[PDB]
């Protein structure tokens, strides 16, 4: 996860409508990193796994779907470095910090 990949506030604006529809064009990148955490925690555990994050990066917004092993390489690398409690999960302690 590159930062600017998370820092597409107009895309998460395409995520958040109906749920909330007030325009706020001062959304700081950390204010929307937690948006990206929120809108992709479908399980409700507030604990992102590689499965939810796979849907985060694959999306349904055409574009060619990336290969499985390359998709492994990014998801294994992000799992390797981003979290530190060895949970199999990315957390607020882990996501916004890394």
């Amino acid at each position: 996860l590159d930062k600017n990949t998370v820092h597409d506030q107009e895309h998460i604006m395409e995520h958040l409508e109906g749920v909330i529809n007030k325009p706020e064009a001062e959304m700081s990148p950390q204010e929307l990193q937690l948006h990206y955490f929120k809108m992709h925690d479908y399980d409700g555990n507030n604990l992102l796994d590689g499965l939810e994050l796979s849907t985060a990066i694959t999306h349904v917004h055409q574009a060619p779907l990336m290969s499985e092993d390359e998709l492994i390489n990014i998801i294994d690398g992000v799992l390797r470095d981003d979290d530190k409690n060895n949970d199999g999960y990315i957390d607020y302690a882990e996501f916004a910090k890394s």
């Binding site: 909330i20 929120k38 499965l51 796979s54 779907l65 530190k84 060895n86 199999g88 999960y89 302690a93």
Partner: protein, 314 residues
């Protein structure tokens, strides 16, 4: 035993099937019908055989697998049933629940049909084969049954949930009844001990449907490798002093509270079956009746234990 989630050996909704129509990490075949919510491994039609297997071989000494599923049968008797497999090869197709016989590994079999005629089924059977044991379906495989628990699992209101725990060479089964919306309402029915498995193997699922018709569907499949707590190493100094973690969390907690506040006035800003609510109320009514009386079990048991100490002290 510290768990480690294996997305590489799991699948789940609400996005279970990718846009190309496939399950990640998992090859479906036969009459397996995967949807973005669940998988119809074997539909309610005659002689349906489906099986979804790990694309990658699994090498975990101790592990645990949680499966959420539902078997639906319009008739009271169900055929054929379901089979979870930790078999060294990927047995996609064959006679045993839609999967091949002579597997090297273990198979857990949910047989609704009582071919044995012994009124066992619906029941759950553990059978471990090295690849040399032919599964006889006619006696419901009672001869090679390592263990079995006779429990009904068809047509439940809530999805039936199974915990399969291989730890310290024993394989223990916890089961949620599917009569409660609780996910963790897991109950012992069976286990085997000194259990030997191939250390490298493939996890898989298969399901068959005979002349009698059942929808075998799997909402989720979760995999957790189990490490022993004395073997899991608590490596320090990677927490970034853990104070920045405390500094970060309450921001997101306040944000989720205000997110609830933001979501409030738009379901009502721009706008459940009666009876289904009432049946749900009756279901949870039975549930906390059972919870109260299980608390009464624990109360009476601790009263017993306290008596066996104060009488001895007197």
């Amino acid at each position: 035993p510290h768990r480690r989630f294996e997305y590489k050996y799991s699948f789940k909704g609400p996005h279970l099937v990718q846009s190309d129509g496939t399950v990640p990490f998992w090859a479906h075949a036969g009459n397996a019908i995967p949807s973005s919510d669940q998988i119809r491994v074997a539909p309610s039609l005659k002689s349906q055989r489906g099986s979804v297997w790990t694309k990658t071989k699994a090498a975990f000494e101790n592990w645990e697998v949680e499966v959420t599923f539902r078997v639906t049968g319009r008739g009271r008797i169900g055929a054929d049933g379901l089979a979870i497999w930790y078999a060294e090869n990927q047995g996609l197709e064959g006679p045993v629940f839609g999967s091949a016989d002579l597997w090297n590994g273990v198979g857990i079999f949910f047989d609704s049909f009582d071919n044995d005629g012994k009124k066992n089924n619906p029941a759950i059977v553990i059978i471990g084969n090295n690849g040399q044991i032919h599964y006889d379906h006619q006696n419901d495989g009672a001869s090679q049954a390592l263990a079995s628990c006779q429990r009904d699992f068809r047509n439940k209101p809530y999805p039936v949930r199974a915990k399969i725990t291989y730890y310290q060479n024993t394989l223990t089964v916890m089961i949620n009844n599917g009569f409660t919306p609780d996910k963790n309402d897991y109950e012992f029915c069976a286990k085997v001990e000194n259990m030997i498995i191939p250390a490298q193997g493939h996890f898989g699922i298969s399901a068959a449907t005979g002349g009698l018709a059942d929808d075998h569907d799997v909402l989720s499949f979760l995999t957790f490798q189990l490490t022993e707590p004395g073997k899991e190493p608590p490596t320090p100094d990677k927490e970034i002093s853990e104070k920045e973690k405390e500094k970060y969390q309450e921001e997101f907690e306040h944000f989720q509270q205000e997110l609830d506040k933001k979501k409030e006035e738009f379901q009502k800003g721009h706008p459940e079956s009666v009876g289904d609510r009432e049946l749900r109320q009756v279901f949870e009514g039975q549930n906390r009746i059972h919870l109260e009386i299980k608390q009464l079990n624990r109360q009476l048991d601790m009263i017993l234990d306290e008596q066996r100490r104060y009488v001895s002290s007197l």
